[PDB]
Symmetry: C3
Subunit: 307 residues, 3 copies
């Protein structure tokens, strides 16, 4: 049974209810376990990219192909948007040709406009502000270990960026406890924190934004990090210095549960945000986490294309 969703698009996870998120995760687990069937026969997903990608690009197109459809890679440097065509005109023409769009870009507003002006589904494959498909797969990865979100503690330590934003919203939706530790000056966006906190009031989630990483990871079941300079960001040399106390290393993780697992969206820079010892060690699940991008997105695609 394909999950029914009351949304055309997936831009932040705010669009989904708790029950819809759980249904997507269960359907992804089903698709992971069972023989491939051509549920999206003949369907074409456009894949617009304005930023680098390995996992998102390959997993989306492979997912479509496994479902009997097609992915069409559209480098943003080749589209007439480069030459000043509006996002609205783009949306309207693509709706005549293909069945959905996944877009990865800088401006979140541009993805909102694309969705608004498109008659086909639009999926955010990462913006400066949100990476929802990553957080959906991460929820699946956590659920495969725990079989529940109740009483689970996730600690994110790092920069208050797009990935942090999506994990905050994801955790709040499913009722999972989440702490964030960032350096001063690099907190997650306050409006997104407020939205997560509001959601958490209804679900029982405890969301805390902190500066002390040792306190944040205390008794955590999962520790998550990400790179210190994201694709959207301008360099500060002083940033690297401020982030040193936020590295995920042996000294930090000993404050979490002995049974904790390490998560990272990838790509990773060993000896910056995380040491080789941690990411390549026995508590790391980053490759299975990455694998689940495929399954979680196939569930999302089948549900959105069924509308």
């Amino acid at each position: 049974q394909v999950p029914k969703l009351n949304t055309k698009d997936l831009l932040t996870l705010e669009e989904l209810t708790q029950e819809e998120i759980i249904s997507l995760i269960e359907f992804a687990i089903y698709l992971k376990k069972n023989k491939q069937e051509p549920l999206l026969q003949g369907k074409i997903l456009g894949l617009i990219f304005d930023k680098h990608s390995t996992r998102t690009r390959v997993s989306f197109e492979a997912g479509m192909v496994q479902l009997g459809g097609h992915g069409m890679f559209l480098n943003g440097k080749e589209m007439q948007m480069q030459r000043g065509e509006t996002v609205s005109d783009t949306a309207k023409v693509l709706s005549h040709y293909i069945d959905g769009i996944m877009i990865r870009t800088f401006s979140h507003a541009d993805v909102e406009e694309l969705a608004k002006e498109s008659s086909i589904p639009v999926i955010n494959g990462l913006t400066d502000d949100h990476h929802p498909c990553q957080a959906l797969a991460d929820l699946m990865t956590i659920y495969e270990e725990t079989n529940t979100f109740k009483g689970i503690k996730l600690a994110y330590v790092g920069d208050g960026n797009n990935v942090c934003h999506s994990l905050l919203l994801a955790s709040a939706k499913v009722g999972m406890h989440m702490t964030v530790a960032t350096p001063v000056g690099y907190r997650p966006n306050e409006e997104i924190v407020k939205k997560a906190l509001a959601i958490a009031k209804e679900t029982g989630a405890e969301i805390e934004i902190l500066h002390n990483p040792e306190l944040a990871v205390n008794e955590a079941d999962f520790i998550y990090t990400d790179v210190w300079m994201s694709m959207g960001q301008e360099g500060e040399e002083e940033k690297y210095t401020l982030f040193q106390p936020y590295q995920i290393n042996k000294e930090l993780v000993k404050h979490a549960k002995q049974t904790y697992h390490f998560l990272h969206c990838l790509p990773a820079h060993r000896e910056e945000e995380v040491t080789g010892e941690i990411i390549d060690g026995p508590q790391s699940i980053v490759f299975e986490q990455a694998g689940n991008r495929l399954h979680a997105q196939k569930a999302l695609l089948v549900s959105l294309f069924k509308n």
Copy 2:
């Protein structure tokens, strides 16, 4: 049935008779209305692009996929032609691997050479001189409104460029009246004008090349424009002032029929060649026009591949 064509390639529309063009339009209209069948099962169309594209790139690959075949995007920057491999050599090797080629580039002579040296069909997806697949779709769009080309008047106002050339030839082939207005120094190519006039002698088409835009649009059924600086032309900034009197705006279109429709190949630059008021207003059909790139091209592909 599938239209029979007496050409391997489609470079300018000169290669087609009136009857063949009408047959293509009727077949496109059939394909637009009827269930997709895999008429090109297993066929691979190579898509060589040396210039930006949204509509041509997406519509050709979607068309192929919808007919059970494949489109293979080939950025010109990645091909060995960028490192000096000849067009002839490229033609000969691609003919061993794939079933047809669509090419968008600068030099029309290059596309002529590709067709001459290739044993597979070659389609011009725009050159500096011709954009024949656009004009074929534009004929289809007109025909859907009028159900005839007899007594219809098309007015093109703008630069004497590739799209103007293809519309001149298309109009002449089907017997439609066409007027052109361009600024002094920007007339369509005189050899192409002569070809169109020669074709028009046989078909009853009245082709008129003018400078005054108000005279050109008088009692028109359709007003068509395009950008002032084509991809073949970035240096030429002077144009922007010269072309201001050629803008499609409320003051201009009142001289056409009250029932006129506005066409534009896209991409468009609002407040340059056309105002938002016109392109976004109730007489604009530019998005249906763009949608018909898909269907007109599918008809062409099935016919060329039938040979």
Copy 3:
């Protein structure tokens, strides 16, 4: 019978026995002659390219499509390797999504690492050091003419580059006599020469590395050359001066058999490494040679995917 191979990967041809190479060539000839069947139904081959390509890029994707599978083009400029992601991390995530990888790049070591860290097959589609699929297709092309490798003489005249290396190892594997002439300072890698000589001891191949092109081509059945400046090279301007005596032209080829045939991997630069008179003349088989990239690689793909 699909050939059984005792290797997961194809990086240099060293991985293959003489019997395996012959079996591959026979299978390629069969595939060339016989109707397409979907032997690789559903399979996805990633095609990672850091360098320009026409033949390799098109032939590998067409081959997959013709076998009922898919080729996914991945420009190296768009992958997170560009932003510092390790080859190992890349290998581990791709293995979750797709079924094999073909990679064209600079560093042969990177391709070795990709193969080591990947659970799926890896194929070298050219590196600075080896171009094994080219030499496999070249052996097929020779065998189609001669029906044997015994008593056949191949002469390569040019730069001691990646293609020279692969021809050396190919010739030694099948027992064909091969001579090389290069300028002073541009010999093939001495360790590769040693490996070829060792293989040749077992097979009866005579391999000679020389400076005098007229001596090298004496009584040759085949003459082969390639460009003087490969994609990986930023060689001195003095190089062109040293290469003047090494052009393949009428004066040189008269020293070979009257029945010789000319080979070139392509792309070629007429009037540099070879004259138009030779490459377009009656002894040239370069376009059949390029065509055989398709068939030889389809044989390899099927065999690797089976294993």
